[PDB]
Structures are given as structure tokens and as C-alpha cells.
Amino acid sequence: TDTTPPTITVPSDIIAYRGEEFEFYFEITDDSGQVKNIELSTFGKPLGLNWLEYSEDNFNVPGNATSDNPLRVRVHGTVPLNEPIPADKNRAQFTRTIRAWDAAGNVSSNITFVIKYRAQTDKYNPADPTITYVDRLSSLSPSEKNAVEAAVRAANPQIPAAARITVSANGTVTITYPDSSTDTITANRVVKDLASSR
């Protein structure tokens, strides 16, 4: 008789960026070769993360969970754009637990996984734009600000389209990601005097 519960393999470095879809996989096997279902929890309490999702595809099918072909459970979601990140950046995580049943009613003991989440600017590193030559460095014209925003946008296609690029009177660039975290580019790397570069 089967008295042995399923065995679960967890990903070791799950990192998510606010507002951006992420995914990761659990791998599960059982000596019977069949896994019935799983439970995501907070150590036996409600999961408490309605944005976390996973497919029950191929659950409880003979052969779905062998050593050669493990049950691969795809977990995905989006950490909310405005999920709180406290002063200590490393507190930004959720520790949760997973267990699985086999077809014989053996349930594994909860093991932990940790979902770390960070601000979008941690993901993004803006390349400097091609220099925009201006008439007065301490007072850019509207067309000069537009050229800057265009140049920055052009130099960083990997940056999200929903990120907003602003430009100050002296050409300082602020890039504000959808989660309101920011990057900055100093004026002396964005604009130069036209008449001097003659």
C-alpha cells in the first residue's frame, strides 16, 4: 500500500517586480506516479494573495507525476503596482507554504517558498540618450524638452511604455515607472550648449 506522500521541489530565488507579470514552477513527484492536488497556504492559514494564480491542468491523472516526468505546476500573477515596500527593502516578501496529496490520501508536510518583490526601478537601468543641443542650458524650450523625452525613450526601448519621462528647465530627466519608483539622468549627460559645441 502507498503510505508515502508526494515530494515537492520549490524554486529558490523567486523575484517579482511590482506591476509586471511573473511566473514560476513547482515540480512534484509521487511513488504512485499520480498527484491529486495541491494547497497554497500561509502555514495552514489562508493564502491571502488574490493576485497569485495557478493552473490545475493535468491534476489527478494517472502518470502525471513520475520521476522522469514530474507534475509541473505553473504559478503566475502580478504583484500590485502599489504593494508596500517598507524602509528596509528586504522586508518586501511573502513567505508561503505548499503541500500536495497523492491518489491514496497521503499529504506532504508544508514546505516554504518565498516570493520577493521589488520596485520597478530595481529592474530598469536607463541608458543615456544621444545629446540634445540647446540654446540655453538653464532654460530649455518646449521643443528641446520634447527632443529630450524622445531621445531618452529612443535609447531605452526595454523600459515600459507606461513609464512617464519628464524633463526639467535645465534638462534633468526623471523616469517614473508605473509603480511610481524613479530613475534620474543628470543634465550634464542629457543636454549641451549649441553655440559652444559649434
Ligand X SMILES: CO[C@@H]1O[C@H](CO)[C@H](O)[C@H](O[C@]2(C(=O)O)C[C@H](O)[C@@H](NC(=O)CO)[C@H]([C@H](O)[C@H](O)CO)O2)[C@H]1O
Residues that bind ligand X (CB under 6 A): 42, 48, 84, 91-95
Nearer to Ca ion, 46 or 157 (CB): 157
**Distance separating alpha carbons of residues 193 and 198, to the nearest angstrom:** 9
Count of C-beta atoms within a 10 Å radius of residue 141: 11
Interacting residues of 18 by C-beta distance below 8 A, sequence separation 6+: 79, 80, 81, 82, 83, 85, 117, 118, 119, 120, 179, 181
What is the closest distance, in whole angstroms, from the C-beta atom of residue 8 to ligand X in the complex? 17
Residue 64 has which C-alpha cell? 502525471
122 binds, options Ca ion, ligand X, a copy of itself, none, Cβ within 5 to 8 A by partner type: Ca ion
What is the closest distance, in whole angstroms, from the C-beta atom of residue 111 to Na ion in the complex? 21
Interaction of residue 77 with a copy of itself, rule CB under 8 A: no
What is the closest distance, in whole angstroms, from the C-beta atom of residue 26 to ligand X in the complex? 18
31 binds, options Ca ion, Na ion, a copy of itself, none, Cβ within 5 to 8 A by partner type: Ca ion
Q: Which residues bind Na ion (CB under 5 A)?
A: 69
Interaction of residue 168 with a copy of itself, rule CB under 8 A: no
Residue 162 has which C-alpha cell? 507606461
Interaction of residue 11 with a copy of itself, rule CB under 8 A: no
Nearer to ligand X, 115 or 152 (CB): 115
Residue that is written with C-alpha cell 511573502 in the block: 94
Binding site membership for Ca(2+): which residues?
2, 4, 30-31, 102, 106, 121-122, 124, 149, 183
Q: Please answer whether residues 79 and 51 qualify as being in contact, where contact means their C-beta atoms are separated by less than 8 angstroms.
A: yes
Residue 23 has which C-alpha cell? 511566473
The upper half-sphere exposure of residue 97, i.e. CA atoms within 13 Å in the direction of its Cβ, equals 12
32 binds, options a copy of itself, ligand X, Ca ion, none, Cβ within 5 to 8 A by partner type: Ca ion
**Distance separating alpha carbons of residues 174 and 85, to the nearest angstrom:** 21
Residues at the interface with a copy of itself (CB under 8 A): 81, 141-143, 145-146, 161-164, 176-178, 180
